């Protein structure tokens, strides 16, 4: 359970930054500030282990990820250089109802912790963590969930990335992938060829009228996992209604009209930092895929077909939920990255990745 009880005293004044820095609460409704945050992340956020790719979250994507129902302006915490007002730090919290084993707790999800490359090792990130903790506590929330590539003490789970090539030649050219150990490039491309049309009957984009049904579908499905979100109708609409270049959700409407399944994946390109011919890698990420009548394998096959039809170069997925049941069959290849999940102020046994039912952007 909780390590420390809900506090009886929380600091009311912001924590002190090092000299030369100032706090700024970012209002992403100001296109100027949203562009500043986009630039910060596009130039300084997470890169692959060999520094060839760097996340390229779009401004619209940041709006989708950072303002779900109940979002708070004070939880978009930025840090600027005082002398020239340049944005050099950021961290964010968004509210969520998170079920850990049997306990449904109001928590925050922490994300987008980023400090400018030139202003690192100045102990800015620890102050950012303290300050977001303070701002969350003052709203009456004392647990958090988050993910990281770094191995910190006592993760609740470790998940592995897998990758399904959709544009093998490009992936090989930019060194995201490599030539098969014993096949020509051409035979590799033939190996990963997908059908031109989906197979599942009744597969169609999600629409507003689907909200409640989708809610019903996900909250039931997620019951089997040890860590998972619990979503109300507003949250379902936010996280799953299609937004072009951001989030795609397809539902399976049975003949009578009931929804029986749905698949979803979000759009998250990577900058290719040093290639003479390629500047970006278009990647889809598996989000939440719920099955009650369609086999999960056919579901994810259709997901791959749709991502391909939409011009994606690769389809990524973690080995959580039931994903291990289709990863190898659908020709995913194991990635070189591990994602750890962590709970703040909650002590509980760790679990396996297939018992993790939470996906963060």
């Amino acid at each position: 359970g909780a390590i420390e009880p809900d506090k009886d005293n929380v600091r009311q004044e912001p924590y002190s930054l090092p000299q030369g820095f100032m706090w700024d609460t970012l209002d992403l409704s100001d296109a100027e500030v949203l562009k500043e945050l986009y630039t910060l992340l596009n130039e300084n956020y997470v890169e692959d282990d060999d520094n060839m790719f760097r996340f390229d979250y779009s401004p619209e994507f940041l709006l989708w990820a950072l303002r779900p129902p109940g979002w708070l302006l004070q939880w978009h915490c930025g840090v600027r250089v005082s002398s020239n007002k340049k944005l050099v730090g950021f961290i964010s919290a968004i509210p969520a109802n998170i079920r850990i084993y049997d306990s449904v707790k109001k928590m925050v999800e922490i994300n987008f912790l980023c400090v400018h490359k030139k202003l690192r090792s100045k102990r800015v990130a620890p102050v950012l963590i303290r300050e977001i903790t303070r701002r969350v506590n003052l709203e009456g929330i004392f647990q958090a969930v988050y993910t990281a590539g770094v191995v910190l003490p006592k993760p609740i789970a470790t998940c592995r990335y897998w990758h399904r090539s959709l544009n093998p030649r490009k992936l090989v050219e930019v060194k995201f992938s490599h030539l098969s150990r014993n096949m020509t490039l051409q035979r590799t491309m033939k190996l990963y060829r997908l059908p031109d049309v989906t197979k599942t009957s009744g597969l169609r984009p999600m629409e507003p009228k689907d909200i409640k049904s989708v809610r019903e579908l996900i909250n039931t499905y997620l019951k089997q996992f040890h860590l998972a979100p619990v979503m109300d109708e507003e949250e379902v609409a936010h996280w799953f209604l299609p937004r072009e270049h951001i989030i795609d959700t397809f539902v399976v409407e049975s003949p009578n009209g009931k929804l029986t399944d749905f698949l979803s994946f979000y759009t998250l390109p990577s900058t290719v930092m040093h290639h003479p011919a390629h500047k970006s890698l278009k990647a889809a990420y598996s989000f939440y895929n719920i099955h009650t009548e369609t086999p999960l394998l056919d579901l994810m096959s259709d997901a791959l077909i749709l991502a391909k039809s939409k011009g994606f170069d690769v389809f990524n997925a973690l080995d959580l939920m039931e994903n291990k049941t289709f990863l190898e069959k659908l020709k995913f290849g194991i990635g070189d990255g591990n994602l750890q999940y962590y709970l703040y102020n909650w002590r509980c046994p760790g679990t396996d990745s297939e018992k993790v039912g939470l996906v963060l952007q």
């Binding site: 060999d50 993910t147 060194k175 995201f176 990255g337």
Partner: peptide
Amino acid sequence: KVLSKIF
């Protein structure tokens, strides 16, 4: 948080 590539 993690930008994985094919191993």
